[PDB]
A paper describes a structure:
Broadly neutralizing antibodies (bnAbs), capable of neutralizing diverse [name]-1 strains and subtypes, represent promising tools for immunotherapy and prevention. bnAbs target conserved epitopes on the [name]-1 [name] trimer, including the CD4 binding site ([name]), glycan-dependent sites at the V3 base and V2 region, the gp120–gp41 interface, the membrane-proximal external region, the fusion peptide and the silent face. The highly conserved [name] is critical for virus engagement of host cells. VRC01-class members, encoded by the immunoglobulin heavy chain gene segment IGHV1-2, include a five-residue light chain complementary-determining region 3 (CDRL3) and are characterized by high somatic hypermutation. To elucidate mechanisms of [name] recognition, we determined single-particle cryo-electron microscopy (cryo-EM) structures of a BG505SOSIP.664 trimer unbound (2.9 Å) and in complex with representative Fabs from each expanded B cell clone: 04_A06 (3.8 Å), 01_D03 (3.2 Å) and 05_B08 (3.3 Å).
In the 01_D03-complexed [name] structure, but not in the unbound [name] SOSIP structure, EM density was observed for residues 57–65 of gp120 on the adjacent protomer, suggesting that this normally disordered loop becomes stabilized after antibody binding.
Residue numbers in the entry:
A (entry chain B), D (entry chain F), F (entry chain D): 519 to 546, 566 to 663
B (entry chain A), C (entry chain E), E (entry chain C): 33 to 57, 65 to 138, 147 to 185, 188 to 306, 309 to 321, 321A, 322 to 397, 411 to 460, ...
The structure:
């Protein structure tokens, strides 16, 4: 155990060891100068936490720290080998080079969950 | 075959601006009671392997602190007596009993008709106003300095001006990255980052030429400037050791309560018991010379070993920028500090700085909102550390002269928020993995 | 083998303090229009098997209600006329026409120069001020009582003072525990607990010696004290049956609108049509004697059967403490409750309490914020039940004397929030069960 | 059906019969005196509910009223028999006597969830 | 066999009222800087197959916008100079130098004693007040019109009254339905409904008889009324083409800064450089006749082809309702508009409307809060389009007369929020699918 | 793709094709006139989104756009044929005629989830 963002500089596999220690710190009077700043900090934390949880639920990954999906890696986002990604590279470096493919990746996860959920309903209806 | 795998809670952050609330460990101006109680044991995590870019001159924490400090000052002056009835013609005479040579003409014994609690009855009262608060109208006739510029509000005597440390704490989903590098200028990569929930106790000390009551550099005197080659950019010096400054107001002043309306009291100045001496500050001559010797030693790095570094006093302007203005025990001193920055440098005793007192205070360089600081009974004496300077250079094409600066109060708190930055935690990450959803 | 099992939604609560919002079923001082509409059918659940510890003297609901009532009072006086020009010298003569023996000198006919709409003009107006509002300056010269102490603000005549019941409702995740025990003295276990979303209609009735228009005890007169053996602790009596009291102001007063500035009107008192009689309160002699007989019967339990219980009047202090102060129809009475607490107890007719009127009111024992209650046109008459008392005992080493108390308004609302308690629902619980996760 | 906290004094089993009635009541203008109190009450309720849901989801029990897990009963937390626990005892007493092992139990649930999610991802990779 | 199936995110909405926040694409009165930055590309979605009911006369958006505009106006006048010393006796003479026949007696040269920055000194200054702002007291003695009724607050000269478009945006979980029907009335089903996140730029233009700066009808002039057969309901006409109105205030007015206290400046009117002419507005005679020809053509549909439609001027009432009041560069005009509604209809040139200026302004039909509009230096000229009318019909049992109306500002913004509607998205739906939970 | 409420007029089946596009738009300073209105809208959106998510979790349908349950569809609610519902009718018309049976349907979904979760706990306990 290292603490909040303890594995920030650790490798991806080592960072995935303690994904929860950063997961539980994303959520946790008069109208004076400090009271208003305190109130808008509480509402901002609630909204920011809820937006990520909604995205996970949209992709069918709510309640799971690690979730596998059914959308392919296009090999244009990143062609790096798996060994050097999880043993020689950190999460901060990952987002830097894939900051622009994020939205298209998110959209792919969106349709995959809805497509397979219709398939689950149709298969189960038999 | 690689499948997009989504991870939650990954340690990824981006630079962002957010509202940082207060935490704190008689009522203050800063309302530190309204701050949430900080944890008894701060939780700091060292982010090994991490190298993050910092910039204190583009730091939003300084700008947000400036707005909060002004807002806290404004909100403590709302439920306070408005001294609009004080804007009346004054018949001021010269305070010339038991005064020394340095205090001749500095105090004015002003008498004026005043409003009584009964609207139809007047009240002839007198008060002692410093020469810096009254301006002659052309015994002679005087008026308060603010009467043609601002509406003056008396500071509530029960509200303390003492800087209580405040911790600026980021909300959940945000982190504050503390740079723990000891040789760190305000700009550039800092390969010793750490994540603390929120900053150390930063005292909102208001001063212009010398940074009092501050945080010392860990190893050596640090010279920090936005552009060291630009003479229009202030130079923030930080001392590795504190220079003690003794600041006293020898006059044994008495607060006199004048009832100027129903429920409104104007706290005037009564006669001083004893002799009237000049307010002053001593800084040790030996300690100051050593500190200047260290300042020039780290100042030659940015200007060459053969350059001539000379310290001269202020160049001109308002009394706030030309003098070491600060607040000591509820009274605002304006110290000359011309014997401090006076030597030139080439390859038990004390320095007495003659200070002057003001009661009508225009603070934050705002025109329109003046404040009356009520007199403090007794003798005021405070001991502080000079933990830094604000030097300004003069243009040239072999010698470099450094004069003290100030005015902008964001320079004062930038020396405390230089090591901190606010980041936005991004816990969603995608990475290809052999795992496939069933 | 026992593997833990986490359960969500378990019925577990812990004692906690939270912000309880208002619910309520012409504008009002307490903005019940800003309260959320309560449900037509309150949902109460009887918690069988449950025994919860209560404490009315450490209850935070009482302290929170005190702040809310003061805040509501303060915010209704903000957009109201400030009577700062009324602090002027008054030329007052006694109102001696068509007055009775008990009103000799109680009313003053005060004339004063008053500011009109035009800044450069003055008007000579007159008003009828009660003797308790004007103090002589040494016809004679008088001044308003508040003028050396407070800035007076005239209460807005369109804002009603009538106490509308308010329900203090806890947010989601919190519950309010209601004691159903009819013999509960406010401290200790409560074998009959019920959970309601929020409290019954608690009228913010302001009174000192008698608890008017309150909640009656179900079975017997209840004596409730923090420490019955301590004479410095007020004794809260609750009546099982109501004692009806009619309080009237026989004077047929007229409200006169004096325009004291642009958009500002000061509602003065015109001449009374008819004779001037003393305001008074009726209390049935038979009903009051029976209630004291029940109070002493329930008071001998804590002091012995052979003790002598004597009721005496208020010892001394402010008029708010020594008199049954209350608000009736927009005017504040201060009653001579000495014919009530007069008897000594050993092992059609009415009691008239001569009350006195005040217009300058210092509520909540606050020094600095006075209020002017504008005159009420016509004859004021209000009917209320005395649903309790606030008795104070005197120290001794065979007789016990009980004098009326008051002053602290938290004791008035403590008699309504005694059965209620705020708890924090904790829905997460862990238990060992023969499960194993897959 | 008894209502909100209707089974507060009932046994463990009877209380577990109707966890939902208490589960659904944990979540459900001008800046005047009452308006700010109402707003702060709303925000406080929202954040309390979200903290509880986050704790549930950290242990992999989101969306389940009864979730049973993979960390042992240490027998120092309690040694009472199942019959007397679930037939002769109430949740109030349970929490009262296990108010102090709660944090270590929560940490055990956290680590168990993370470990089993790692195991699921590794087994699914085959 | 059919088991229920819950679907999340279904496109179902219900009519509801919510708080719509502002979005916007020198400080302004309506604080459009405080509005969140709207998206550069609005996301508008066409809802084909959808027929939704609309009603612009029971629309809550209009009522909500009225409160927001009043609240925005009130908050911009809080940190502004209170001209309570202006309520003093004035010695006014007519401005008779270099005036035309139409300005004889309209301007008053008022001299008065004003408080200076010193409390004990008076200042004799003069200012030019329009005849509509001063009322005689019975050179002659005058006073400001509001001095018996309202407390006047000078509008801050650095805050502009120019209507900046504001977009009323619904929160998440709410949608705004936009009717794209180009022949859409105010009430009834709309075959062509569409969802947009929030409305177009709706300029809060304040006017009474003519709807300026507005949104034009797509195809033809649209006549909208709550009940076309009721003469007590205003008729909202919308123009398919804009009628250009040119409004000028020819006088070269000078703003004179009179310092009435510490930090308080009252901006008076100095002498006009040059001749003094009457403020006026030009509407093209050819363009206005054509638009009336289109209005009557669309007005005969609700009243018959053989009816006689006559346009008469406004009936009696306040100057706000009898004149085309509007705001032009910070100065409030009150234009007669008796030559506009002048003709009777049976089955290069310009119209000059003589306007009158006012500085003391009472808007929102509120009594008690007046505002002083400071003079604008130089000549003011405005170019606007008349995009609609507010007509009022007179009762009768063969001719129909239509007089201009106004007063209620909600009718001015109802002409912009007629096509919009706020709905409450309900994403939970249940359907009987054959699927059964395994 | 049609956008937010793009399938508002679509048939039941076509509307279910894009349940996600409406699902993600349900969630996403000084105390001035606009600041308070903008703050009230932020808190109102959060508590409104959380109320529907709580209901889905109550019925055991959190994280699923389409969830099938185990309570019968009474013909008293609607006797319309399946073919004419999902091919000839829109979601607006569905809620209009079943706005009154909604609460009793919600209660049936409430009890089914708790009953089946007791069965899952008891069956697994063996
Ligand atoms: C830098 O820090 C020092 C120490 O914290 C500050 O000096 C302190 O100043 C306060 C008033 O501002 C002094 O408190 C006062 O003490 C007197 C005498 O006991 C008492 O009569 C007053 O009511 C008040 O409590 C405090 O003693 C003093 N500490 C010392 C002298 O060691 C100093 O002001 C700071 N520099 C600033 C704020 O510029
Ligand atoms: C205890 O409760 C009783 C009943 O609510 C209160 O009596 C009522 O007091 C109000 C004024 O507080 C009286 O209102 C007045 O009524 C007249 C006639 O309609 C009207 O002209 C006045 O403007 C005003 O509204 C009301 O008539 C009176 N009625 C009864 C039944 O007594 C009593 O004041 C309360 N006692 C308290 C709060 O101490
Ligand atoms: C600052 O230093 C001066 C001297 O440098 C101090 O003044 C001396 O005060 C002592 C009493 O403590 C006298 O006996 C001396 O005569 C003074 N010297 C002078 C006037 O030259 C002064 O007290 C110091 N102030 C502080 C430490 O607050
Ligand atoms: C309280 O009681 C007194 C008498 O005990 C009432 O005063 C009497 O009122 C009646 C009219 O109702 C008169 O005829 C009598 O002359 C009054 N005096 C006496 C001595 O009887 C008084 O009105 C009562 N207070 C009320 C009704 O508010
Ligand atoms: C207070 O006043 C009420 C009247 O408002 C009195 O009630 C009346 O009492 C008489 C005699 O008992 C009855 O004849 C009336 O019918 C009652 N009127 C009612 C109930 O409306 C009451 O007695 C007075 N209380 C006291 C102590 O004098
Ligand atoms: C409005 O129209 C009038 C004429 O109908 C304009 O007045 C004329 O102004 C010109 C200067 O541009 C003079 O040469 C004429 O003598 C004026 N005619 C008169 C007074 O009858 C007026 O300028 C127009 N105002 C505008 C366009 O704002
Ligand atoms: C004019 C008005 O207020 N409402 C009308 C209504 O009377 C009419 O029935 C409907 C369609 O004809 O169009 C709308
Ligand atoms: C930093 O990197 C080294 C190898 O370069 C690695 O062994 C170490 O674990 C990393 N730091 C952390 C905290 O993981
Ligand atoms: C009083 O002091 C002032 C300094 O402000 C000086 O100008 C003046 O000459 C002095 N008067 C006397 C009589 O010393
Ligand atoms: C107070 O006012 C009187 C009025 O005549 C004047 O004589 C006197 O000098 C004044 N006193 C002052 C201004 O101190
Ligand atoms: C500041 O520090 C950075 C990194 O250590 C360095 O690159 C730079 O030269 C230093 N000076 C300035 C003026 O940025
Ligand atoms: C007026 O009343 C006062 C009591 O307030 C009294 O002292 C005085 O004698 C009275 N004057 C008369 C009755 O003339
Ligand atoms: C009003 O003022 C005049 C001024 O002299 C004074 O004579 C009169 O007595 C005053 N009237 C009062 C105080 O009622
Ligand atoms: C109230 O009842 C409790 C019940 O145990 C008892 O302990 C307590 O002494 C009682 N209080 C008084 C004042 O009698
Ligand atoms: C001044 O103007 C007024 C109009 O308000 C008029 O009645 C009066 O006759 C004028 N007097 C002169 C001398 O012009
Ligand atoms: C100012 O006051 C003086 C006092 O006598 C008066 O004569 C003069 O007319 C006033 N000036 C005005 C009202 O403009
Ligand atoms: C609208 O109706 C037509 C025919 O009824 C249908 O083909 C079309 O798909 C519908 N619109 C949508 C968005 O489904």
């Amino acid at each position: 155990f290292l603490g909040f963002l303890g594995a920030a500089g650790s490798t991806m596999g080592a960072a995935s060891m303690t994904l929860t220690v950063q997961a539980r710190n994303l959520l946790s009077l008069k109208l004076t100068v400090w009271g208003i700043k305190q109130l808008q900090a509480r509402v901002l934390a609630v909204e920011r936490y809820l937006r990520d949880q909604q995205l996970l639920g949209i992709w069918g990954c709510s309640g799971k720290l690690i979730c596998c999906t059914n959308v392919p890696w296009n090999s244009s986002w990143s062609n790096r080998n798996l060994s050097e990604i999880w043993d020689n590279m950190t999460w901060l470096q990952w987002d830097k080079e894939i900051s622009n493919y994020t939205q298209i990746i998110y959209g792919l996860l969106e349709e995959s969950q809805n497509q397979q959920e219709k398939n689950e309903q149709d298969l189960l209806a038999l | 075959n690689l499948w997009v795998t989504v991870y939650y809670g990954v340690p990824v952050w981006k630079d962002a601006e957010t509202t940082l609330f207060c935490a704190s460990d008689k009522h203050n101006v800063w309302a530190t009671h309204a701050c949430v109680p900080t944890d008894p044991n701060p939780q700091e995590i060292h982010l090994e392997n991490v190298t993050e870019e910092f910039n204190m001159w583009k730091n939003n924490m300084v700008e947000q602190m400036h707005t909060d400090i002004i807002s806290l000052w404004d909100q403590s002056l709302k439920p306070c007596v408005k001294l609009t009835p004080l804007c009346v013609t004054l018949q001021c005479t010269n305070v010339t009993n038991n005064i020394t040579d340095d205090m001749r003409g500095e105090l004015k014994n002003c008498s004026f008709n005043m409003t009584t609690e009964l609207r139809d009855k007047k009240q002839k009262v007198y008060s002692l106003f410093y020469r810096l608060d009254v301006v002659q109208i052309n015994n002679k006739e005087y008026r308060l300095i603010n009467c043609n510029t601002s509406a003056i509000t008396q500071a509530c005597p029960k509200v303390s001006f003492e800087p209580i440390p405040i911790h600026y704490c980021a909300p959940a989903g945000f982190a504050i990255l503390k740079c723990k590098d000891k040789k760190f200028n305000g700009t550039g990569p800092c390969p010793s980052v750490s994540t603390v929930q929120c900053t150390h106790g930063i005292k909102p000390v208001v001063s212009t030429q010398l940074l009092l009551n501050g945080s010392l550099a860990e190893e050596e005197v640090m010279i920090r400037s936005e552009n060291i080659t630009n003479n229009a950019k202030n130079i923030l010096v930080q001392f590795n050791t504190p220079v003690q400054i003794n600041c006293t107001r020898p006059n044994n002043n008495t607060r006199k309560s004048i009832r100027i309306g129903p429920g409104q009291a104007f706290y005037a100045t009564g006669d001083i018991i004893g002799d009237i001496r000049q307010a002053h500050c001593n800084v040790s001559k030996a300690t100051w010379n050593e500190t200047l010797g260290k300042v020039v030693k780290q100042l030659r790095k940015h200007f060459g070993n053969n350059t001539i570094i000379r310290f001269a006093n202020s160049s001109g302007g308002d009394l706030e920028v030309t003098t070491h203005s600060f607040n000591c025990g509820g009274e605002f001193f304006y110290c000359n500090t011309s014997g401090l920055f006076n030597s030139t440098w080439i390859s038990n005793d004390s320095i007495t700085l003659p200070c002057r007192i003001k009661q009508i205070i225009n603070m934050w360089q705002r025109i329109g909102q003046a404040m009356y600081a009520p007199p403090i009974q007794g003798v005021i004496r405070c001991v502080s550390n000079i933990t830094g300077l604000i030097l300004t250079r003069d243009g040239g094409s072999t010698t470099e002269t450094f004069r003290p600066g100030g005015g902008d109060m964001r320079d004062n708190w930038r020396s405390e928020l230089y090591k901190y930055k606010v980041v936005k935690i991004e816990p969603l990450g995608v990475a290809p993995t052999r795992c496939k959803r069933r």
